[PDB]
Structure formats: C-alpha cells, structure tokens
Design an enzyme around this catalytic site. Structure first.
Site, PDB file in Angstrom:
ATOM      1  CG  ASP A  17      -1.862  -5.436  11.652  1.00 43.79           C
ATOM      2  OD1 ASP A  17      -0.741  -5.321  12.238  1.00 43.79           O
ATOM      3  OD2 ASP A  17      -2.348  -4.729  11.218  1.00 43.79           O
ATOM      4  CG  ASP A  61       3.256  -3.917  11.119  1.00 51.86           C
ATOM      5  OD1 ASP A  61       4.327  -3.416  10.777  1.00 51.86           O
ATOM      6  OD2 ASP A  61       2.207  -3.628  11.864  1.00 51.86           O
ATOM      7  CG  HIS A  97      10.194  -3.629   6.427  1.00 54.91           C
ATOM      8  ND1 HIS A  97      11.760  -4.349   5.936  1.00 54.91           N
ATOM      9  CD2 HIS A  97      10.139  -4.837   6.266  1.00 54.91           C
ATOM     10  CE1 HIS A  97      12.096  -5.414   5.974  1.00 54.91           C
ATOM     11  NE2 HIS A  97      11.380  -5.825   6.299  1.00 54.91           N
ATOM     12  CG  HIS A 183       1.516   0.848  10.189  1.00 59.73           C
ATOM     13  ND1 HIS A 183       1.645  -0.291  10.352  1.00 59.73           N
ATOM     14  CD2 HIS A 183       1.943   0.971  11.265  1.00 59.73           C
ATOM     15  CE1 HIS A 183       2.056  -0.938  10.746  1.00 59.73           C
ATOM     16  NE2 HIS A 183       2.537  -0.886  11.311  1.00 59.73           N
ATOM     17  CG  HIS A 219       0.591  -1.218  14.315  1.00 61.68           C
ATOM     18  ND1 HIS A 219       2.243  -1.800  14.558  1.00 61.68           N
ATOM     19  CD2 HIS A 219       0.737  -0.673  16.156  1.00 61.68           C
ATOM     20  CE1 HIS A 219       3.012  -1.961  15.411  1.00 61.68           C
ATOM     21  NE2 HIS A 219       2.373  -1.308  16.180  1.00 61.68           N
ATOM     22  CG  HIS A 221      -2.107  -8.144  16.433  1.00 63.47           C
ATOM     23  ND1 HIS A 221      -0.835  -9.206  16.868  1.00 63.47           N
ATOM     24  CD2 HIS A 221      -0.411  -7.402  15.284  1.00 63.47           C
ATOM     25  CE1 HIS A 221       0.505  -8.417  16.646  1.00 63.47           C
ATOM     26  NE2 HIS A 221       0.248  -7.612  15.817  1.00 63.47           N
TER      27      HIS A 221
HETATM   28  C1  LIG Z   1      10.534  -5.902   3.244  1.00 63.75           C
HETATM   29  O1  LIG Z   1       9.696  -5.873   1.387  1.00 63.75           O
HETATM   30  C2  LIG Z   1       8.578  -5.418   1.250  1.00 63.75           C
HETATM   31  C3  LIG Z   1       8.139  -5.391  -0.831  1.00 63.75           C
HETATM   32  C4  LIG Z   1       7.430  -5.146  -0.975  1.00 63.75           C
HETATM   33  C5  LIG Z   1       6.289  -4.612   0.297  1.00 63.75           C
HETATM   34  C6  LIG Z   1       6.549  -5.076   1.843  1.00 63.75           C
HETATM   35  C7  LIG Z   1       5.557  -4.065   2.298  1.00 63.75           C
HETATM   36  C8  LIG Z   1       5.322  -4.227   3.921  1.00 63.75           C
HETATM   37  S1  LIG Z   1       6.325  -4.634   4.901  1.00 63.75           S
HETATM   38  C9  LIG Z   1       5.932  -4.326   6.280  1.00 63.75           C
HETATM   39  S2  LIG Z   1       6.186  -4.028   7.711  1.00 63.75           S
HETATM   40  N1  LIG Z   1       4.399  -4.179   5.878  1.00 63.75           N
HETATM   41  C10 LIG Z   1       4.068  -3.932   4.400  1.00 63.75           C
HETATM   42  O2  LIG Z   1       3.448  -3.779   3.917  1.00 63.75           O
HETATM   43  C11 LIG Z   1       8.195  -5.059   1.654  1.00 63.75           C
END
Ligand SMILES: COc1cccc(/C=C2\SC(=S)NC2=O)c1
Ligand SMILES: COc1cccc(/C=C2\SC(=S)NC2=O)c1
Lengths: 327, 327
Positions: A17, A61, A97, A183, A219, A221
């Site tokens: 996070d 995060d 993401h 997560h 996830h 905080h």
């Molecule tokens: C968005 O390109 C990347 C490239 C490498 C790692 C990440 C990790 C992320 S993004 C997110 S929200 N939590 C994570 O662990 C994202």
C-alpha cells in the site's frame, strides 16, 4: 540467490500500500507526498538489508493512480523494486490496476529474472528464497469487475470460496513453506472506513487456509493483526494519505518463520507525518489564535472543521503552510 | 554465456520493422496480418538457432501502433523477445514510440537481465555477446518532437552531427567490436517512397562512423545495403505492409564479423505473401474476367485501380477473397 542448504527459517519483509505518486488534498492545498513517502521506503529497504531478510512480499496498491500513473511514480516504483531485488527475492501481488498490459509486463519480468515474481492469478507459484528455502505462494488477487458485473451476489461468493478451497488443497502439497497472499478486505474489520467510491471484495477471515505459515494481506491502510492461526497481517500504508488515518499505525512488518514453531514478527514503523483535524464551534479570534499557534509547532498537516458561519475567513491557508483543508 | 578466449568472430542476427499488430487496408477489407507475420518471425528465430548467432540486433518499429498497441501485439512482442533471449543476447533500439513508460520499462528490464539491452539514448553501452565477445553499441535513436520542434534547420542538423561525431570518438575506444545502431532515413535513398504522415530524420550515409564494424539501421521497409565500409544495412520489414512494397525484399540478415577481415552477410528471406496492383483504364467484361482469373491463382493480396467510371461494380470483393482494395 545463494544456494545455502535448505534451512528451517525464513526471514520475511512484508510491506504494501505504498500509493506512489499520490498528491493529497489536490483541490484545497496540493501536497506532494513523494518526499515523505520515499523517506519511509528508504527506511524499510535499509531495515531489510540490516535484518538480512530472505524474502520480500508486496501485496498491492503500490501506485496511487489506477489509470495513468505519472512517469515519476512509475520510475520510483521500478527504482524501489530494483533496490529490493538486490537484497532478497521479491514476490509482487499487485492491486486492482486498470490496464491489462500489467499482466504481460509482469509475466515477462518474471520470466527473465530469478529475483522477482509477479503473481497475477489464483494459480500457485513455487519460489526459492535467499537461503534456498522453497516457498509455495498461494495468491488471491482481485478477481474481476466483469465477474462482479454478473450482479448475482450468491454465485460470486461461491466463486471466491471455491478459489480459496483450491489454495488450501495446494498448500497441503507444500515443501518447506507455504505463504498466502491476498488483496481484499477482511469481513468485519474493527474500525473499517468504508468504500472509497468502488466495489470491494469481502472475505471472511476464517476462510483463509489455516495450513499456510503466513497470510500476507494488502489493501487496508492501517496495520492489522487479523489472526494468529494462520498469522494474518495487513502491514498498512507508509504515510497517512488523508484525514481519517490519524490513528493508524503505519509501516511494514518483519516476519520470521521456523518449522514446527510459532511465528514471530516485529513492526517496522515508518514514522509518518501526523494528521490533525481541528474542530471549532465558531471561527472567532480566540479560535484563530488556537489555529495558528497549533500549526506553528505541529510537524504534520492540519484540517480545520467548523459549522458556524464566521463571515469571510481571513487568508488562513495563504498564511499557514501546513493547513491543507478547511471544511 | 560461453567465455571463449581470443575469439575473433561475432555472428549477428539483425532484424527490424516488424510492425506487430498491423491490420492492412482497414478502410476497404481489413486483413489481420498476424498469422503471416508470426510465420515470418518463427522462420527468423529458427534460422538464428541453426546458425547459433552470438548477438541479436533489433532496430525499431517492432510495433505498428505508436500509441495504444493491442494486448495481442504487446504479447507477441514480449513472446518473441523471450524466444530470442534464449538463443542469444538481444540489443533493442526502439523506434519513435509515443508513451514515455517505454524508457522506464526498458531501463528496468535492462537492469535485471544480462540477455537483453534497451538502448534509448545517444549514450553508448557495452554488452557481452553469447561467446564472451565485448561489443560496444553506438546507438542513434529517433530524437524527440521537442528537439525537432526547434524548427531551426541549421542547429538541428548540427545537433545530429555532434552526436554522430561523439559516437565516432567512443567507437575508437572499442574493445573487440563496435556496432552502430540507428533508426532514421538515409539521405538520397534510391527509390524512397516519401514521408508517411510524419516528420522524419534525414542523415547522410557518410556521417556514419567509419570505424564501426557494422551499422545496423532500421525504419526502412525494404532490404538495402547502404554501403560497404562501414557495412550499413536496412534489413527491411518481414511482410509487405501496403501496396508500393510489391518489389521489396523482405526478411532479416545474418552478419559475421572477423577481426582484420572483411564482413560477410547473407539475407534471410521471410518468403512474404506477394502484393499486386491491377491497373485498368475501364472496368469492362474483358477486364472483369482478367480480375477473376488472376486472383484465383494469385497466392497474395490484390489491389484493383481504375479511373474510368464503369457503372455499379458487381460484388467483386464478395466473390474474390484476396481482393482487398478497389481504388
Ligand atoms: C502499473 O505498472 C506496474 C508495474 C510494476 C508493478 C506494478 C505493481 C502494482 S500496481 C498496483 S495498484 N499495485 C502494484 O503492486 C505496477
Ligand atoms: C511499447 O512497449 C514496448 C515494449 C518493449 C519493446 C518495445 C519496442 C519497440 S516499440 C517500437 S515503435 N519499436 C520498438 O522496438 C515496445
């Protein structure tokens, strides 16, 4: 990785996070949190090298922006991944993401490097720690909006519960250590803030496979020791991102596992800047002196809340640099 | 990597301008070129494994879309990078891509693997080939819209020549081999089509550092031996991307360098599907039978051009599967 003969110990750094790239209170007084955040991350990386950790767990995060992360935010992320990989193997469970290329980048990076693994499915992955320990990763990422777009709550719960049962079965076939990575939001979290304009996944803490040696969650905080068997921990974020996190514990955790023995862990406090909400009945001159004198000695950021109309307020924010919000 | 001592040889595979993700003639009959393109790429990978090349050079335009390449296009790219890395170390000089994350991704991937290198600046990089040969890479990528936005033709050319002279100086400080990699258009290209909706960089072939053992260029879709000393080659694309490339040679090149001896190279033809433009003054029945009989035996794609109005044309494309355009 060293190939030290497979030991019964596993020293773990678990942080999550990060919210890299966040600027707080952008619509009142934008405060770039990057300097405080990197100061906390440097503290965690240095502590891991001091403690000579065998494995590093990241549970999502890590970036604040789900859509278009800034070049600066993405640079810092890849920078800190690099520093941690030099210390110990890194396992990354990313958050929800938005762009699908992340899975291809993650699989590509996992294929070309022995020091980092991206787990972006419910399929388990076996990894080798710094001192040769074999670790089975039981990953439980955010599923999908699409499967959630089914809108039938009953089957969606059954989908998640069947995924957990499989992770239990595969945890039985471990070799040295089995580690759960999830997560999501644990059901009934004592003092849970709420949904931040989004559909969340609620999982009962008892459904976590009891046979795993450690359950690394992200996830949330705030630091949370969810349970002791299996040991289940939210490390929390590294900074206080917005008001409401005034009472949270912030940092990472250092976990040591021994076969047949109970796990031990220590918190690594990030020493984050404090937050404070000032409540006043009416903003009068006596209350104005309280506001100014407080911020002069307060090392963090301050919010002022008042309901009684007090006319046109004097330029408090143009005068007070750590007063970031008046609502 | 093997570490052969006193090795005077360097076997090179050089390919570029893949244009992964391209769909041709989207405004008449969309033809997904993916199957033909992967068929050509597999042929190149197999030949490199047969010849056991020491180094693999990629000089840009590997993706057709500069903005948002499809997930399929990015997956195919990372897939083929992985296959080539298993054969020999790979040096990648990308074309003028649009999203800034590419440099951060490239530098991160370069840091965690010895088998792939992204050169995305004018700064030289030393790499180790398959059998231990030390190779100094002299990279000359597409600059930026910003430095080109200077709009002063004199200073911009002097900037490019300054970078070329600097690359010459560092090429003198080579160890075993020095290789120039550029993504631009050579001045006065015999039968150059023209600008395809973009501002391009024009470089005189004499400005290439004469002390390099090989000059690997990209951006041009046809195979071209620009000069012999230093050996300077455009490999060309792997498929015939649009009409106008009917007569181009398509494929990669296999280059062998020996100390004190002249360089040798062979073309690796991709065996691409052919293109044909059929020109008719007026579409009559004699021209209509000609169109049908030709395409029935033509293994590639056909364009029909005619200027005299010939009434409502019969459904020629609804009849002929490889007739992709009528203009
Ligand atoms: C968005 O390109 C990347 C490239 C490498 C790692 C990440 C990790 C992320 S993004 C997110 S929200 N939590 C994570 O662990 C994202
Ligand atoms: C756009 O994400 C990536 C990721 C890895 C390599 C590339 C290469 C490119 S893109 C282009 S145009 N020419 C190239 O060689 C692009």
């Amino acid at each position: 990785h060293h190939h030290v003969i497979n030991l019964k110990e596993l020293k773990i750094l678990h942080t999550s996070d990060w919210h890299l790239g966040v600027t707080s209170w952008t619509s009142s007084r934008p405060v770039d949190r990057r300097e405080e955040l990197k100061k906390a991350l440097d503290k965690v990386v240095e502590e891991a090298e001091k403690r000579e950790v065998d494995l590093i767990l990241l549970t999502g995060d890590l970036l604040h922006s789900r859509n278009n992360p800034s070049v600066v935010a993405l640079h810092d992320l890849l920078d800190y991944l690099k520093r941690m990989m030099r210390t110990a193997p890194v396992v990354v469970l990313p958050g929800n993401h938005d762009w699908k290329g992340l899975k291809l980048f993650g699989n590509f990076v996992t294929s070309i490097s022995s020091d980092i693994t991206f787990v972006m499915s419910f399929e388990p992955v076996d990894v080798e720690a710094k001192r040769g320990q074999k670790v089975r990763i039981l990953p439980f990422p955010y599923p999908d909006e699409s499967e959630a777009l089914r809108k039938n709550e009953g089957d969606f719960r059954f989908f998640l519960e069947s995924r957990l049962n499989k992770l239990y079965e595969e945890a039985l076939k471990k070799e040295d250590f089995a580690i759960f990575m999830g997560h999501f939001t644990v059901e009934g979290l004592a003092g849970y803030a709420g949904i931040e304009q989004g559909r969340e996944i609620i999982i009962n803490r008892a459904l976590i496979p009891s046979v795993v040696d450690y359950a690394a969650l992200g996830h949330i905080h705030s630091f949370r020791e969810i349970q002791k068997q299996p040991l289940t921990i939210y490390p929390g974020s590294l900074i206080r991102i917005d008001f409401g996190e005034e009472a949270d514990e912030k940092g990472a955790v250092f976990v040591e596992l021994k076969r047949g023995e109970p796990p031990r862990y220590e918190r690594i406090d990030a020493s984050p800047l404090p937050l404070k909400t000032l409540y006043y009945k009416k903003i009068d001159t006596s209350a104005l002196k309280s506001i100014r004198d407080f911020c002069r000695n307060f090392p963090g950021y301050v919010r002022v809340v008042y309901e009684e109309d007090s006319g046109i307020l004097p330029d408090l924010m143009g005068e007070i640099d750590n007063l970031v919000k008046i609502e």
